[PDB]
Each structure stands twice: as structure tokens, then as C-alpha cells.
């Protein structure tokens, strides 16, 4: 909602404001905004446009690109460690908050379709919270957990225009 507007004003800003290389905070928000849409191609291309000058100047930006390298592999546990690695207050946090929750939803959603049966330890990597916390949650939602083996199972107006058209 709020984020979509924030990409719009920022997208405008990249072309309009600079002499061709814009300042380091603007590029960081923009990169972070591309990850929320999960438009990873344009993200990657964003980093490749970025000169060596911004990479020395700004390290935060390079952290935002690292989450994204993993999103390309689609390896979940790896995503989570990188979210914790870097923070940049104000300028990165509201959009970051959204990134973390967009990948968890993507992960739960992915599993629900993907697997008719999955190991609970693998599932623990996907949501990214330990085994005790996960097994407690799945039960409430209404998914079945098997214990001993520890496996988890996911669960007129048109017509007149058309008649008018054919008769003519």
C-alpha cells in the first residue's frame, strides 16, 4: 500500500534529480523496494548499474543486495541470517520490516502448495523459527503433524453488446 507509492516517488526521483549518478540513500531505498515486489531481475540490474564509488561509500546497500543473491538461489535459511546482518535506521527500517514478513509469507505459501508431506526440521528453516515454535503453530492453523517420525503434512449488459455486435 504505502510501499507502492514510495516506489513511485523514488522511481521518478532516480532519473530527475542527479547528474546521472544519484546519492547513496536513494539507491538503497529503491533497491530494497524492488525486493518487496520480488522483481529480482530489475534489482540485480540495479546493483550492476551501481558504480564502484557507491560500493566503497555505502556498505548497507551491499547488504541489501546480499539477501537478494540468495532469493535468486531460493534458499530460505540463508535469507533470514542476512535480514539480521544489517540494519540502517529510518532510511532502511520501514521497508525492511516488510521484506522480512514478505519472505515468510512466500515461504509458508510455497510449502502449502509444494509439499503434500515435508520433514519438520526442513520446515523449520522455511519459516525460520525453531522446531518447538513451529509444531505449536501448525496445529492451530489445522495442518497435521505426525510425531515419532516427525513429519508435517500441509493441507444482461455484456450479452446485449455481443448480440448487437454480431447482428449489426
Amino acid at each position: 500500500f504505502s510501499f507502492k507509492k514510495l516506489l513511485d516517488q523514488c522511481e521518478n526521483q532516480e532519473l530527475e534529480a542527479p547528474g546521472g549518478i544519484a546519492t547513496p540513500p536513494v539507491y538503497g531505498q529503491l533497491l530494497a523496494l524492488y525486493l518487496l515486489h520480488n522483481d529480482m531481475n530489475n534489482a540485480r540490474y540495479l546493483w550492476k548499474r551501481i558504480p564502484p564509488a557507491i560500493k566503497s561509500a555505502n556498505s548497507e546497500l551491499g547488504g541489501i543486495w546480499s539477501v537478494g543473491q540468495r532469493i535468486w538461489q531460493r534458499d530460505f535459511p540463508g535469507i533470514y541470517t542476512t535480514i539480521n546482518a544489517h540494519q540502517w535506521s529510518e532510511t532502511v527500517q520501514p521497508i525492511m520490516e516488510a521484506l522480512r514478513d514478505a519472505t515468510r509469507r512466500r515461504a509458508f505459501a510455497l510449502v502449502s502448495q509444494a509439499y503434500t508431506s515435508i520433514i519438520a526440521d526442513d520446515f523449520a528453516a522455511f519459516v525460520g523459527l525453531p522446531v518447538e515454535e513451529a509444531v505449536k503453530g501448525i496445529l492451530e492453523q489445522g495442518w497435521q503433524a505426525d510425531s515419532t517420525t516427525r513429519m508435517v503434512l500441509p493441507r444482461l449488459a455484456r450479452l446485449t453488446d455481443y448480440v448487437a455486435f454480431l447482428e449489426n
Binding site: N12, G20, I21, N42, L110, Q113, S117, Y162
Partner: protein, 403 residues
């Protein structure tokens, strides 16, 4: 006597207060005959209405010097052209199209020299908008917009221009030719494949082949070569071309694109190991022609095809079995490959890690959904508008006398 350039400036405002625009087209084109710095002096007392049409003639000479745009001070000249496009607008623009286009190609060439062509994209898209109806007519500034985006990655502004399909180009007073037509579509294909919008890419690429030609060009080779790679992703072999394709694409281009014909041939055998070996054999071509990285996708798409054909055949199949036959060589990767495809929605499947099986589903539609009714209803509205374009165009020929 006096200097030509001072005398020319005061006259334009008259032709811009009157219906007598065809005269004005001459006055901007000559511009003063021989020019120098002398135009910069006219700009100061140039306003009396907006800055008028004249200014466009000033900007066309200064950029067409093929040297400095206007000393190291060039950013100022840039601030002036965004002012022309924005505030002035141009309602007599249909006549201006020749100079406007010349100026726009010249801008893009100069921005490409600078540290990054980023700053150019933002003026260049608003620049095209002014010559267009509101419906969108395709002309040469469209090609150059894609070029700026290609060099300095930021594909996002160009997309509303591309995502619209059209009829008829912007004409009256020249300002256009078949190369521009071909380059706009070549690049627009290039961009869509990148987004992994294989549907629009194929279509964009096709329009770069169907264009009439009696002569060879560098864009025609590239357009053909990129077409073979895309059709190797979307389809299991190369997708058809109509019989209104140009003569040149058969006669010259086919022995010219031998390597690609061998890619398509190995892909039809349905063996990745051979396709892989071929890519290293053919490598230098791929690099000089610079459709590297695309050639890599065709290899991943064979592995996708090889997994997806198994679905058709099996209800249930093991991961170990999938892995040997597809030549993934690791059941772990079999599970990884379908899972990527689940997110994409190229496959409907479920994984059983107790049994070490994959179960295929395959049931997105039963065709009795109201969802499907609404989808078919939306598709009809498109058809009725498409027909309406044809009626106006058939009628237009009906007015013209037949030969």
C-alpha cells in the same frame, strides 16, 4: 547588411499567432544558414508567448555540432530542452517531427558519451508523449528511449510504452524509417525476456522479422538469432513465421545463423549434455554477437521441458528415477527444480518426502467455474475492439479510390 540570425528570430511569433504554420517549418530548418554562438543571444528576448517553435531549431543546431554541446556549460542547455517539452508543449508538433526526431537522436548520442545516460531517460519519455495522440503512435524516439534504458539499467519507465500494441506510425514531414522500426522492437524484445515475460518478448521479436526489407542490416541478424533463443524457451522447437516475412530472412540470414540452427537441432534431441558441449564449441560467435547469457537460458529451459514431459506420462515417479533420466544427477536437485517451478506456476505438483516420490496433480481449471466465464467475457471485449480498428481502416481504403 545585417546578420541573418537576428532577422530570423522576430518573424516566428507571427506565424505562431496565425494559421500559417507551413512557413514556420522552413524558418526553423535553415536557422540562420551558418551558425555559431550567435543563437545563444536570441534566447534571452525569445519569449513573448512561450519561447515558440523557434527554440527547437536552436537546440537542433547546438547539439548537431558534433563537438561540444555548448562549452563545459552543457547542463544549462539540458535545462532549456526539458522546458521546451514541458511548458511550451507544442500543438503544431506534427510539422516539427523531423527536427524533433533529429534533436532527440542527437541528445541520446551525447548522453551516452557522459557518465551515465540516466539523467536523459526522464526527459526523453515526456518528449515522445507530446507528439502522440493519447492513443500512442510509434516513431523513432521510442527506439532511443529503449537504448537509454539498456545502457543505464532502469527498464521500469519504458514499460507502459511497450506494453501497448498499435497501428500506424507518426508521420507527416518524414522523421521516420524502417531501421527505427526494427531497432525499437529488437530492444523491446530484449527487455521483456529480461523481465522473464516470455509472451511479450516473442511477439516483440516477431515484429522485428516481419518488417519488409530488400537489403541486409545488422539489426536483422540479431533479431533472428534472438528469436531462435526465445522460441527455444517458450516452445520445444522454433515457433512458426508467416508467409509475409521478408525474402532476406530466408536467402541471406539462414546460412548466416548456422550455429543457432544447430542449437535448435540439439535441443530437439532432448539431451542437455550435448547442448552444453555445443555451447562451448559455438562460444566465440555468442560473445561477438552478444546474446550471451540468453544462450544459457535455453539450457535451463531444456531441463524444464525434460521435467515437464514426465508429468504428462506419470502420476507418481520417484525423485531418484527423475534424477537419472533428466540427468539432474541428484534427487535433491529434482526436488529443488520442481519447487522453483511451483512458485513460478509452470507445474502443478506435490512432493512426498516420506515415500521419496513426486506426485503430479494437473488441475487448474475444470472449466465450469464462473472465473473461467469472466475470463472468456474479458477476451470478447478485446475482440470487439480489435474488429472496430479494422472497420475504420477498411473504411479508410473504401474512401480512397481503388486501382
Amino acid at each position: 547588411m545585417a546578420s541573418a540570425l537576428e532577422q530570423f528570430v522576430n518573424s516566428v511569433r507571427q506565424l505562431s499567432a496565425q494559421g500559417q504554420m507551413t512557413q514556420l517549418c522552413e524558418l526553423i530548418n535553415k536557422s540562420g544558414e551558418l551558425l555559431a554562438k550567435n543563437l545563444s543571444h536570441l534566447d534571452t528576448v525569445l519569449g513573448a508567448l512561450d519561447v515558440q517553435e523557434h527554440s527547437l531549431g536552436v537546440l537542433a543546431v547546438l547539439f548537431v555540432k558534433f563537438s561540444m554541446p555548448s562549452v563545459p556549460d552543457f547542463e544549462t542547455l539540458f535545462s532549456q530542452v526539458q522546458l521546451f517539452i514541458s511548458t511550451c508543449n507544442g500543438e503544431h508538433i506534427r510539422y516539427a517531427t523531423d527536427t524533433f526526431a533529429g534533436l532527440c537522436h542527437q541528445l541520446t548520442n551525447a548522453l551516452v558519451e557522459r557518465k551515465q545516460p540516466l539523467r536523459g531517460i526522464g526527459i526523453l519519455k515526456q518528449a515522445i508523449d507530446k507528439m502522440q495522440m493519447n492513443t500512442n503512435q510509434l516513431t523513432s524516439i521510442h527506439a532511443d528511449l529503449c537504448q537509454l534504458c539498456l545502457l543505464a539499467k532502469c527498464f521500469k519507465p519504458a514499460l507502459p510504452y511497450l506494453d501497448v500494441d498499435m497501428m500506424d506510425i507518426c508521420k507527416e514531414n518524414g522523421a521516420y524509417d524502417a531501421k527505427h522500426f526494427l531497432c525499437y522492437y529488437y530492444y523491446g524484445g530484449m527487455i521483456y525476456t529480461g523481465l522473464k515475460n516470455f509472451e511479450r518478448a516473442l511477439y516483440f521479436y516477431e515484429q522485428a522479422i516481419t518488417t519488409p526489407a530488400m537489403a541486409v542490416s545488422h539489426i536483422m541478424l540479431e533479431s533472428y538469432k534472438k528469436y531462435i533463443l526465445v522460441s527455444l524457451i517458450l516452445l520445444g522447437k522454433v515457433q512458426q513465421l508467416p508467409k509475409y516475412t521478408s525474402q532476406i530472412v530466408g536467402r541471406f540470414i539462414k546460412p548466416l545463423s548456422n550455429a543457432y540452427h544447430e542449437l535448435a537441432q540439439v535441443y530437439s534431441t532432448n539431451n542437455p549434455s550435448e547442448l552444453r558441449n555445443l555451447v562451448n564449441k559455438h562460444s566465440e560467435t555468442f560473445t561477438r554477437d552478444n546474446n550471451m547469457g540468453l544462450v544459457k537460458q535455453c539450457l535451463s529451459s531444456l531441463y524444464k521441458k525434460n521435467i515437464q514431459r514426465l508429468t504428462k506420462t506419470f502420476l507418481t515417479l520417484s525423485l531418484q528415477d527423475m534424477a537419472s533420466r533428466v540427468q539432474l544427477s541428484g534427487p535433491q536437485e529434482a526436488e529443488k527444480y520442481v519447487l522453483h517451478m511451483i512458485e513460478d506456476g509452470e507445474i502443478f505438483a506435490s512432493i512426498n518426502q516420506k515415500d521419496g516420490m513426486v506426485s503430479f496433480h494437473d488441475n487448474p481449471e475444470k472449466y465450469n467455474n464462473p472465473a473461467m466465464l469472466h475470463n472468456i467475457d474479458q477476451e470478447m471485449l478485446k475482440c470487439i475492439e480489435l474488429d472496430e480498428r479494422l472497420k475504420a481502416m477498411d473504411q479508410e481504403i473504401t474512401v480512397n479510390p481503388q486501382f
